Amino acid sequence: VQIVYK
Amino acid sequence: VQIVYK
Amino acid sequence: VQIVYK
Amino acid sequence: VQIVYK
Amino acid sequence: VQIVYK
Amino acid sequence: VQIVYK
Amino acid sequence: VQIVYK
Amino acid sequence: VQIVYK
């Protein structure tokens, strides 16, 4: 699982 | 699991 | 598990 | 487990 | 994120 | 993040 | 982060 | 961070 916040 | 906050 | 805060 | 705060 | 293995 | 192995 | 092995 | 091995 990958979650990326930008 | 990877979570990255930017 | 990797969590990175920037 | 790696947690990095920047 | 929750991952459960059974 | 919670990971549970059973 | 919580990891539980059973 | 909590890691429990059983």
UniProtKB/Swiss-Prot annotation, chains A, B, C, D, E, F, G, H:
Tissue: Expressed in neurons. Isoform PNS-tau is expressed in the peripheral nervous system while the others are expressed in the central nervous system.
Entry's localization field: Cytoplasm, Cytosol; Cell membrane; Cytoplasm, Cytoskeleton; Cell projection, Axon
Modified residues (N6,N6-dimethyllysine): 6
Cross-link Glycyl lysine isopeptide (Lys-Gly) (interchain with G-Cter in ubiquitin) mapped to chain: 6
Annotated site, Not glycated, chain positions: 6
Modification note: Phosphorylation at serine and threonine residues in S-P or T-P motifs by proline-directed protein kinases (PDPK1, CDK1, CDK5, GSK3, MAPK) (only 2-3 sites per protein in interphase, seven-fold increase in mitosis, and in the form associated with paired helical filaments (PHF-tau)), and at serine residues in K-X-G-S motifs by MAP/microtubule affinity-regulating kinase (MARK1, MARK2, MARK3 or MARK4), causing detachment from microtubules, and their disassembly. Phosphorylation decreases with age. Polyubiquitinated. Requires functional TRAF6 and may provoke SQSTM1-dependent degradation by the proteasome. PHF-tau can be modified by three different forms of polyubiquitination. 'Lys-48'-linked polyubiquitination is the major form, 'Lys-6'-linked and 'Lys-11'-linked polyubiquitination also occur.
Residues bearing the modification N6-acetyllysine: 6
Disease entry from the Swiss-Prot or TrEMBL record: In Alzheimer disease, the neuronal cytoskeleton in the brain is progressively disrupted and replaced by tangles of paired helical filaments (PHF) and straight filaments, mainly composed of hyperphosphorylated forms of TAU (PHF-TAU or AD P-TAU). O-GlcNAcylation is greatly reduced in Alzheimer disease brain cerebral cortex leading to an increase in TAU/MAPT phosphorylations. Frontotemporal dementia 1: A form of dementia characterized by pathologic finding of frontotemporal lobar degeneration, presenile dementia with behavioral changes, deterioration of cognitive capacities and loss of memory. In some cases, parkinsonian symptoms are prominent. Neuropathological changes include frontotemporal atrophy often associated with atrophy of the basal ganglia, substantia nigra, amygdala. In most cases, protein tau deposits are found in glial cells and/or neurons.
Domain notes: The tau/MAP repeat binds to tubulin. Type I isoforms contain 3 repeats while type II isoforms contain 4 repeats.
Description of how the protein assembles with itself and partners: Interacts with MARK1, MARK2, MARK3 and MARK4. Interacts with PSMC2 through SQSTM1. Interacts with SQSTM1 when polyubiquitinated. Interacts with FKBP4. Binds to CSNK1D. Interacts with SGK1. Interacts with PIN1. Interacts with LRRK2. Interacts with LRP1, leading to endocytosis; this interaction is reduced in the presence of LRPAP1/RAP.
Free-text function comment from the UniProt entry: Promotes microtubule assembly and stability, and might be involved in the establishment and maintenance of neuronal polarity. The C-terminus binds axonal microtubules while the N-terminus binds neural plasma membrane components, suggesting that tau functions as a linker protein between both. Axonal polarity is predetermined by TAU/MAPT localization (in the neuronal cell) in the domain of the cell body defined by the centrosome. The short isoforms allow plasticity of the cytoskeleton whereas the longer isoforms may preferentially play a role in its stabilization.
Protein name from the UniProt record: Microtubule-associated protein tau
